[PDB]
Design a protein around this ligand. Structure first.
Ligand code: MG
Ligand code: MG
Ligand code: MG
Ligand code: MG
Ligand code: MG
Ligand code: MG
Ligand code: MG
Ligand code: MG
Lengths: 55, 100, 271, 77, 149
RNA sequence: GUUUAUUAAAAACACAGCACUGUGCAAACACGAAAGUGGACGUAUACGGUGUGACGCCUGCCCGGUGCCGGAAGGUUAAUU
């Protein structure tokens, strides 16, 4: 359901240095976090999101 | 005969050829009884990180439904086309036509 | 395939053969053959110039198209056949205009496959294009040193050349030996590796096997007398000398290349 | 035939002497080179086997005068 | 070497000067060309009688070249065809001979040796600029475009 | 299998196999004052040299000496000036 192109919402679940925020903090469900991570990694590959703050 | 989602970024200097490539790629699938369910030209966008000493790329979206061979034979063309860099394809179960 | 012979007799225990059922069992293409005679290592003066050459089975040369200048005419692989003159096999191709030629068989080529040569040819094994149009990082074989001169690199059974960089009018090639060399982008190359990669797994098994292919015995320098070889003799087995060639040049380490003409194209040596 | 076509220089034989004055026969041969000189009169390039000294002779006398001597000697060029 | 210049040379000197140069420079370049001749008493007297007309004649050669340069410059567009691939990438190339023939075809006769291609060999489609050297002191320019189907 | 034709046929030589090393093609190398020729109408799964000598289990330590390879700031150093 979570789409990697839905780029506006992705910063809500990543930090400044590109860290993926853990579910314990964001409170997202386990199922959604798994697909969320896939979306984030997918976006990073397309240069839509940064892997880290250093490039 | 499955649903596919195709994203490919081209060299910014080739921003004037993107309409041509879309027609050729669309023609190839439509010739094999396929049909395009979504087409979107996202324009030149800022890259999150540089690729090959390059910072701006032209983004487009292409969600299609076609047989195995036409995408498989389309991938090889993507490889040797220097204009396009870092293309991706995906598998989907249902056709989607949203603005996104 | 590689088959180990059963030890039915000495000289057959250790023999390992390379069997390719796809090779043509019949006679070669007669109009594309010519006679080549054995020299025995003798030059025009009659002196033995290179040693350990002599005898062996009679062989007939076959004109192999090393240039591949037939541009824009597709051809079909008629058959693969054995080539006594080289480690690799040769694929007989038929251009649809009615002309037949011999080419080195690539890794995956088989009878009936489509092959095309030219600047606009598709990127498939067996197709010949200038390295200018060939994408970088692609494996190629039968590379020409000069445009139009014919391929001279990666002609052996399983050899190949990797295109690593393309800068301006020159392409840097990773040769099979490990040395990096610069060649003009206008030179042609054939996509894909050379076929019959199992040629290195065969074992002759017996002394006569080497003789069949014109390799005469090699005599060690230690067993020589001082007059014949620098290693000389000595009562018993005495060496006490730095190893050298039979003409006194030090071997086993001494660099020998002295070509100042083309060291410009050698970006990096093999080691 | 390592002979200059202009000055007629040919290899000559001498011996090289070491510090102990040992004499071993040797040969002195000229600085012949293959060079082509334009003939301003005939609009064509002429190539002949000449030495460094011979080139200077052509420089001083001129190519046109030099080829005249070769014709007199019957040497083909 | 001491030589007599028959034409304006870029850096060595001007017409009629007596300036020494390297033997190789005069032997292999100036003498085979018309730029200069060896400096000897024989030619010096011949030069003096020939001095008046050579200076006058060399003025007409660059005048025709300048006139021919304008004629070349008049044809501001030349169209050539070649093997053009996808996204305008040509598999082949457009050599100096190809561009030379185009200008003479229904145009002005231009030698193959006066075409200048500093940016390369025009291996890409579109329109590019090519320069010619009709004479040592004149220039010609024109836009050249290649298209094919 | 080969060898001292005519006192030595062998444990000697060769051998398939193994290893080191050279060689990017106008290859190294070799015969030639040179042209040229062989290597090879072959192209590093190729070719030359060297040692070992099927196969099986293995092949330890030492780079001071000699040789080779790499670098070379410095010292010393030829013709020439
Ligand atoms: Mg040998
Ligand atoms: Mg051996
Ligand atoms: Mg003995
Ligand atoms: Mg002893
Ligand atoms: Mg006896
Ligand atoms: Mg006996
Ligand atoms: Mg032994
Ligand atoms: Mg040991």
């Amino acid at each position: 359901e979570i789409d990697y192109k839905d780029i506006a919402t992705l910063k809500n679940y990543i930090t400044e240095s590109g860290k993926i925020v853990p579910s314990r903090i964001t409170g997202t469900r386990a199922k959604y976090q798994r697909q969320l991570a896939r979306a984030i990694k997918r976006a990073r590959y397309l240069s839509l999101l940064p892997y880290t703050d250093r490039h | 005969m499955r649903h596919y989602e195709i994203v490919f970024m081209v060299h910014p200097d080739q921003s004037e050829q993107v309409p041509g490539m879309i027609e050729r790629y669309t023609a190839a699938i439509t010739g094999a009884e396929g049909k395009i369910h979504r087409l979107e030209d996202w324009g030149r966008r800022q890259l999150a990180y540089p690729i090959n000493k390059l910072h701006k790329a032209h983004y487009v979206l292409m969600n299609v439904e076609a047989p195995q061979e036409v995408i498989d034979e389309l991938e090889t063309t993507f490889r040797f086309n220097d204009a396009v860099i870092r293309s991706m394809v995906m598998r989907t179960k249902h056709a989607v036509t949203e603005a996104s | 395939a590689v088959v180990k012979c059963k030890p039915t007799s000495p000289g057959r225990r250790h023999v390992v053969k390379v069997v390719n059922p796809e090779l043509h069992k019949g006679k070669p293409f007669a109009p594309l053959l010519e006679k080549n005679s054995k020299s025995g290592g003798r030059n025009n003066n009659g002196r033995i110039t290179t040693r350990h050459i002599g005898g062996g089975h009679k062989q007939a040369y076959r004109i192999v198209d090393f240039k591949r200048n037939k541009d824009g005419i597709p051809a079909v692989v008629e058959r693969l056949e054995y080539d006594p003159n080289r480690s690799a096999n040769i694929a007989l191709v038929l251009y649809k205009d009615g002309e037949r030629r011999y080419i080195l068989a690539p890794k995956g080529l088989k009878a009936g496959d489509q092959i095309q040569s030219g600047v606009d040819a598709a990127i498939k094994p067996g197709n010949t294009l200038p390295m200018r149009n060939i994408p970088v990082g692609s494996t190629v074989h039968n590379v020409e040193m000069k445009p139009g001169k014919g391929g001279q690199l990666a002609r052996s059974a399983g050899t190949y050349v990797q295109i690593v960089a393309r800068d301006g009018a020159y392409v840097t090639l990773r040769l099979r030996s490990g040395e990096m060399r610069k060649v003009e982008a206008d030179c042609r190359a054939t996509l894909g590796e050379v076929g019959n990669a199992e040629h290195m797994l065969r074992v002759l098994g017996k002394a006569g096997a080497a003789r069949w292919r014109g390799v005469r015995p090699t005599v060690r320098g230690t067993a020589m007398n001082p007059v014949d070889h620098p290693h000389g003799g000595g009562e018993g087995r005495n060496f006490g000398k730095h190893p050298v060639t039979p003409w006194g040049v030090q071997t086993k380490g001494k660099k020998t290349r002295s070509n100042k003409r083309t060291d410009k194209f050698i970006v990096r040596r093999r080691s | 035939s390592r002979v200059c076509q202009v000055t007629g220089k040919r290899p000559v034989t001498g011996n090289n002497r070491s510090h102990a004055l040992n004499a071993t026969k040797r040969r002195f041969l000229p600085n012949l080179h293959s060079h082509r000189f334009w003939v301003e009169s005939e609009k064509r390039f002429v190539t002949l086997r000449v030495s460094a000294k011979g080139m200077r002779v052509i420089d001083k006398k001129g190519i046109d005068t030099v080829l005249a001597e070769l014709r007199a000697r019957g040497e083909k060029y | 070497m001491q030589v007599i210049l028959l034409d304006k040379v870029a850096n060595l000197g001007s017409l009629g000067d007596q300036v020494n140069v390297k033997a190789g420079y005069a032997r292999n370049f100036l003498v085979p060309q018309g730029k200069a001749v060896p400096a000897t008493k024989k030619n010096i007297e011949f030069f003096e009688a020939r001095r008046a007309e050579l200076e006058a004649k060399l003025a007409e050669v660059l005048a025709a070249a300048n006139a021919r340069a304008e004629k070349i410059n008049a044809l501001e567009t030349v169209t050539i065809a070649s093997k053009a691939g996808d996204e305008g990438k040509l598999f082949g190339s457009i050599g100096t001979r190809d561009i030379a023939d185009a200008v003479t075809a229904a145009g002005v006769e231009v030698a193959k040796s006066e075409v200048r291609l500093p940016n390369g060999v025009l291996r890409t489609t579109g329109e590019h600029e090519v320069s010619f050297q009709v004479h040592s002191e004149v220039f010609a320019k024109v836009i050249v475009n290649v298209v094919a189907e």
